Amino acid sequence: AKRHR
Amino acid sequence: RGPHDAAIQNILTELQNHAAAWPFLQPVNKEEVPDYYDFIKEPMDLSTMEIKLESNKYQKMEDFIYDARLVFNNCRMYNGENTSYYKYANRLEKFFNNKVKEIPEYSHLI
């Protein structure tokens, strides 16, 4: 999944 | 035809075909990445660039380059430096830089 660093 | 239309279409087609392009082909889906638009204020993706090109929005090559850079930079802004997305951004940008720089008329922009 893509998620804020 | 626009003075940059053919060059822009060719570059955009290559970007979309690229192995590293898959994350950037369409806008980020808010349901899959709920906070994305809380952070990214100038979102961009290749389908948006294609639509801008077709809608006569790229009179200046500079505008197309700006949009390509939003895709790469937005990606490195949101995602961690150790993620696959960051890697894809770097790869697609390197490719983009080479493709534009190799056209003498636009080498000054890279």
From Swiss-Prot, chain A:
Transmembrane segments: none annotated. The modification N6-acetyllysine is found at residue 2. The gene is HHF1. The nucleosome is a histone octamer containing two molecules each of H2A, H2B, H3 and H4 assembled in one H3-H4 heterotetramer and two H2A-H2B heterodimers. The octamer wraps approximately 147 bp of DNA. Histone H4 is a component of the UAF (upstream activation factor) complex which consists of UAF30, RRN5, RRN9, RRN10, and histones H3 and H4. Disulfide bonds: none annotated. This is Histone H4. Present with 524000 molecules/cell in log phase SD medium. The lineage of its organism: Eukaryota, Fungi, Dikarya, Ascomycota, Saccharomycotina. Core component of nucleosome. Nucleosomes wrap and compact DNA into chromatin, limiting DNA accessibility to the cellular machineries which require DNA as a template. Histones thereby play a central role in transcription regulation, DNA repair, DNA replication and chromosomal stability. DNA accessibility is regulated via a complex set of post-translational modifications of histones, also called histone code, and nucleosome remodeling. Residues 2-5 bind DNA. It is found in: Nucleus; Chromosome. The chain holds residues 16 to 20 of 103 of the full protein. Belongs to the histone H4 family. It comes from the Eukaryota.
Swiss-Prot record, chain B:
It is found in: Nucleus; Cytoplasm. Disruption phenotype: Sensitive to amino acid starvation. Increased sensitivity to genotoxic agent generated DNA damage. Transmembrane segments: none annotated. It comes from the Eukaryota. Residues 1-103 form the Bromo domain. Histone acetyltransferase that acetylates histone H2B to form H2BK11ac and H2BK16ac, histone H3 to form H3K9ac, H3K14ac, H3K18ac, H3K23ac, H3K27ac and H3K36ac, with a lower preference histone H4 to form H4K8ac and H4K16ac, and contributes to H2A.Z acetylation. Acetylation of histones gives a specific tag for epigenetic transcription activation and elongation. Operates in concert with certain DNA-binding transcriptional activators such as GCN4 or HAP2/3/4. Its acetyltransferase activity seems to be dependent on the association in different multisubunit complexes. The bromodomain mediates acetyl-lysine binding in histones. Component of the 1.8 MDa SAGA (Spt-Ada-Gcn5 acetyltransferase) complex, which is composed of 19 subunits TRA1, SPT7, TAF5, NGG1/ADA3, SGF73, SPT20/ADA5, SPT8, TAF12, TAF6, HFI1/ADA1, UBP8, GCN5, ADA2, SPT3, SGF29, TAF10, TAF9, SGF11 and SUS1. Present with 1180 molecules/cell in log phase SD medium. Belongs to the acetyltransferase family. GCN5 subfamily. This is Histone acetyltransferase GCN5. The chain holds residues 329 to 438 of 439 of the full protein.
